[PDB]
Design a protein around this motif. Structure first.
Motif, PDB file in Angstrom:
ATOM      1  N   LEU A  23       0.838  -1.189   0.000  1.00 54.12           N
ATOM      2  CA  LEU A  23       0.000   0.000   0.000  1.00 54.12           C
ATOM      3  C   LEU A  23       0.874   1.240   0.000  1.00 54.12           C
ATOM      4  N   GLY A  24       2.140   1.059   0.367  1.00 51.05           N
ATOM      5  CA  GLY A  24       3.105   2.144   0.350  1.00 51.05           C
ATOM      6  C   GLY A  24       4.291   1.865   1.251  1.00 51.05           C
ATOM      7  N   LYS A  25       5.243   2.791   1.281  1.00 49.41           N
ATOM      8  CA  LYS A  25       6.446   2.602   2.079  1.00 49.41           C
ATOM      9  C   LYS A  25       6.532   3.677   3.152  1.00 49.41           C
ATOM     10  N   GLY A  26       6.803   3.250   4.381  1.00 51.60           N
ATOM     11  CA  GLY A  26       6.932   4.174   5.491  1.00 51.60           C
ATOM     12  C   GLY A  26       8.377   4.329   5.922  1.00 51.60           C
ATOM     13  N   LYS A  27       8.595   5.144   6.947  1.00 48.79           N
ATOM     14  CA  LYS A  27       9.944   5.398   7.437  1.00 48.79           C
ATOM     15  C   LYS A  27      10.588   4.142   8.028  1.00 48.79           C
ATOM     16  N   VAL A  61       3.737  -0.905   4.310  1.00 45.43           N
ATOM     17  CA  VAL A  61       2.366  -1.230   4.649  1.00 45.43           C
ATOM     18  C   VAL A  61       1.829  -2.085   3.509  1.00 45.43           C
ATOM     19  N   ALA A  87      -5.146  -3.490   6.442  1.00 39.77           N
ATOM     20  CA  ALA A  87      -3.795  -3.105   6.098  1.00 39.77           C
ATOM     21  C   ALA A  87      -2.874  -3.530   7.213  1.00 39.77           C
ATOM     22  N   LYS A 100       0.732  -2.920   8.700  1.00 40.65           N
ATOM     23  CA  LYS A 100       1.880  -2.036   8.729  1.00 40.65           C
ATOM     24  C   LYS A 100       3.031  -2.753   9.413  1.00 40.65           C
ATOM     25  N   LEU A 160      -8.681   6.474  12.070  1.00 42.58           N
ATOM     26  CA  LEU A 160      -8.302   5.147  11.550  1.00 42.58           C
ATOM     27  C   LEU A 160      -8.282   4.139  12.680  1.00 42.58           C
ATOM     28  N   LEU A 211      -4.325  -2.639  10.802  1.00 44.05           N
ATOM     29  CA  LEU A 211      -5.040  -1.373  10.610  1.00 44.05           C
ATOM     30  C   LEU A 211      -6.248  -1.462   9.702  1.00 44.05           C
ATOM     31  N   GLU A 212      -7.207  -0.578   9.946  1.00 41.80           N
ATOM     32  CA  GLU A 212      -8.283  -0.346   9.006  1.00 41.80           C
ATOM     33  C   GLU A 212      -7.689   0.012   7.649  1.00 41.80           C
ATOM     34  N   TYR A 213      -8.175  -0.639   6.594  1.00 42.93           N
ATOM     35  CA  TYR A 213      -7.774  -0.305   5.236  1.00 42.93           C
ATOM     36  C   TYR A 213      -8.578   0.859   4.688  1.00 42.93           C
ATOM     37  N   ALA A 214      -7.878   1.913   4.265  1.00 42.07           N
ATOM     38  CA  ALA A 214      -8.521   3.099   3.695  1.00 42.07           C
ATOM     39  C   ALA A 214      -8.332   3.114   2.195  1.00 42.07           C
ATOM     40  N   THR A 245      -4.756   9.186   0.403  1.00 42.65           N
ATOM     41  CA  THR A 245      -4.574  10.297   1.344  1.00 42.65           C
ATOM     42  C   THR A 245      -5.225  11.575   0.850  1.00 42.65           C
ATOM     43  N   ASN A 248      -1.341  12.498   6.531  1.00 42.08           N
ATOM     44  CA  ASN A 248      -1.793  11.555   7.557  1.00 42.08           C
ATOM     45  C   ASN A 248      -3.308  11.536   7.692  1.00 42.08           C
ATOM     46  N   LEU A 263      -6.295   9.783   5.792  1.00 46.17           N
ATOM     47  CA  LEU A 263      -6.681   8.812   4.772  1.00 46.17           C
ATOM     48  C   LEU A 263      -8.167   8.923   4.469  1.00 46.17           C
TER      49      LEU A 263
HETATM   50  N1  ADP Z   1      -4.359   1.929   6.684  1.00 46.70           N
HETATM   51  C1  ADP Z   1      -4.020   2.261   5.418  1.00 46.70           C
HETATM   52  N2  ADP Z   1      -4.833   2.107   4.350  1.00 46.70           N
HETATM   53  C2  ADP Z   1      -4.433   2.454   3.108  1.00 46.70           C
HETATM   54  N3  ADP Z   1      -3.204   2.946   2.827  1.00 46.70           N
HETATM   55  C3  ADP Z   1      -2.297   3.122   3.819  1.00 46.70           C
HETATM   56  C4  ADP Z   1      -2.665   2.778   5.193  1.00 46.70           C
HETATM   57  N4  ADP Z   1      -1.612   3.045   5.985  1.00 46.70           N
HETATM   58  C5  ADP Z   1      -0.636   3.541   5.173  1.00 46.70           C
HETATM   59  N5  ADP Z   1      -1.056   3.581   3.891  1.00 46.70           N
HETATM   60  C6  ADP Z   1      -0.254   4.038   2.736  1.00 46.70           C
HETATM   61  O1  ADP Z   1       1.058   3.566   3.000  1.00 46.70           O
HETATM   62  C7  ADP Z   1       2.004   4.625   2.960  1.00 46.70           C
HETATM   63  C8  ADP Z   1       2.921   4.466   4.160  1.00 46.70           C
HETATM   64  O2  ADP Z   1       2.500   5.485   5.045  1.00 46.70           O
HETATM   65  P1  ADP Z   1       2.698   5.457   6.628  1.00 46.70           P
HETATM   66  O3  ADP Z   1       2.423   4.068   7.131  1.00 46.70           O
HETATM   67  O4  ADP Z   1       1.868   6.614   7.123  1.00 46.70           O
HETATM   68  O5  ADP Z   1       4.277   5.762   6.702  1.00 46.70           O
HETATM   69  P2  ADP Z   1       5.005   6.499   7.937  1.00 46.70           P
HETATM   70  O6  ADP Z   1       5.057   5.470   9.048  1.00 46.70           O
HETATM   71  O7  ADP Z   1       6.347   6.852   7.345  1.00 46.70           O
HETATM   72  O8  ADP Z   1       4.121   7.687   8.237  1.00 46.70           O
HETATM   73  C9  ADP Z   1       1.197   5.909   3.063  1.00 46.70           C
HETATM   74  O9  ADP Z   1       1.679   6.875   2.128  1.00 46.70           O
HETATM   75  C10 ADP Z   1      -0.226   5.554   2.720  1.00 46.70           C
HETATM   76  O10 ADP Z   1      -0.497   5.997   1.390  1.00 46.70           O
END
Ligand code: ADP
Lengths: 264, 109
Positions: free
Chosen positions: A14-18, A22, A35, A37, A69, A85-88, A92, A136, A138
């Motif tokens: 769904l994406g990449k975090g620090k 996810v 989702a 994480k 969320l 986590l709840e999937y959104a 964003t 932050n 969603l």
């Molecule tokens: N619960 C979710 N549902 C859908 N997309 C998500 C969810 N959590 C994160 N994402 C996507 O995954 C990416 C990673 O974000 P996030 O987990 O917020 O990283 P960080 O921990 O760096 O803030 C985000 O840009 C978001 O687009």
């Protein structure tokens, strides 16, 4: 901890975090889509934020609101922590702003209503949220926003100095000047977001750190000509240097511009 | 065999008095460094966070794996069930069995 990775089928990222990625996932028994994480312990420890995360995850576990969320649970193995986590599904608000450039008054007032409702609920639970950034927020299947940052506080007031974020753009003056802060930060956030939603950029944005610091501290902002009188009134009432002069959340929800334009 | 020991399990106090609740994570090397406090007031269904400040204060004793909550100048409104809840250094959920506080007297009046 009772959930385990083998309980889930993993799908696309769904994406990449620090601190990890996810993923889309589903729980095998119920086939419920969610989702997952994933955070690497070694990275959390490297950055020295693991203790803080444990505090935040605990707080988050109690918050049940359509515009917050949902955290369903968590687990860990030798190297990683997993947040369920709840999937959104609609991404964003940050991305939506990139695609649309600016929001109209109905979308803006509706989003501000959802945020104020969420923050009202938070007050009833006596948890404080810190600054709110569009990346932050969603979006659920019906287009409703969800506060997704776990950025909670239980000290009122607080003298805390997290987060070394990207810019200062979403921080109130009391946070950047080093004074105490509490729930009144909420209203500053609503003002910054209301402006950004209507204009396409936050009100204190600048090319340098120095100028942004100065504009926030001085509350130096101006409106493009298309911003209407009611929006100007609300935003100007929210962006007060003195936190005690900012309105109550009920006053935001009852503001004539909000009630005129909100779909909710 | 890790356990969170919360004391006192039952407390009756009079208005104006102070209450300290203690939570200790025993029989484990896992550290209790992240405690949050919660209350459900008597007659209510809503759990609330205990926000630190004013009448509410809290301490942590890292050396003894303990945390405390002190409420001073107790009021009748403070009657309810109180719990410490945390995620410990082993990422495991910990919660105390709770303090059932009754504030009776001594002047309303
Ligand atoms: N619960 C979710 N549902 C859908 N997309 C998500 C969810 N959590 C994160 N994402 C996507 O995954 C990416 C990673 O974000 P996030 O987990 O917020 O990283 P960080 O921990 O760096 O803030 C985000 O840009 C978001 O687009």
């Amino acid at each position: 901890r009772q959930w385990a990775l083998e309980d889930f089928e993993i799908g696309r990222p769904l994406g990449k975090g620090k601190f990890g990625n996810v993923y889309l996932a589903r729980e095998k028994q119920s086939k419920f889509i969610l989702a997952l994480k994933v955070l690497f312990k070694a990275q959390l420890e490297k950055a020295g934020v693991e203790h803080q995360l444990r505090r935040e995850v605990e707080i988050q576990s109690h918050l049940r609101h359509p515009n917050i969320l949902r955290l369903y649970g968590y687990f860990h193995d030798a190297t990683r922590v997993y947040l369920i986590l709840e999937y959104a599904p609609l991404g964003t608000v940050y991305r939506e702003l990139q695609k649309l450039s600016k929001f109209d008054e109905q979308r803006t007032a509706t989003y501000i209503t959802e945020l104020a409702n969420a923050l009202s609920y938070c007050h009833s639970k006596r948890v404080i949220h810190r600054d709110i950034k569009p990346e932050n927020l969603l979006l659920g299947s019906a287009g409703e926003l969800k506060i997704a940052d776990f950025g909670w506080s239980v000290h009122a007031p607080s003298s805390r100095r997290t987060t070394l974020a990207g810019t200062l753009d979403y921080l109130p003056p009391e946070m950047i000047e080093g004074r105490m802060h509490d729930e009144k930060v909420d209203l500053w956030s609503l003002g910054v977001l209301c402006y950004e939603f209507l204009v396409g950029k936050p009100p204190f944005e600048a090319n340098t750190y120095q100028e942004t610091y100065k504009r926030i501290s001085r509350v130096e902002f101006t409106f493009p000509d298309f911003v209407t009188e009611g929006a100007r009134d609300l935003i100007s009432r929210l962006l007060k240097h003195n936190p005690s002069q900012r309105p109550m959340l009920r006053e935001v929800l009852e503001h004539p511009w909000i009630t005129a334009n909100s779909s909710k | 065999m890790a356990r969170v020991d919360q004391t006192p399990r039952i407390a009756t106090k009079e208005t104006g008095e102070s209450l300290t609740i203690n939570c200790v994570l025993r029989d484990t090397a896992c550290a209790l460094d992240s405690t949050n406090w919660y209350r459900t007031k008597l007659g209510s269904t809503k759990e609330q966070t205990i926000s630190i400040g004013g009448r509410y204060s809290e301490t942590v004793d890292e050396g003894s794996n303990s945390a405390s909550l002190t409420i001073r100048d107790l009021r009748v409104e403070d009657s309810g069930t109180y719990k410490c809840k945390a995620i410990d250094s082993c990422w495991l959920s910990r919660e105390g069995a709770g303090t059932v506080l009754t504030v009776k007297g001594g002047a309303a009046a």
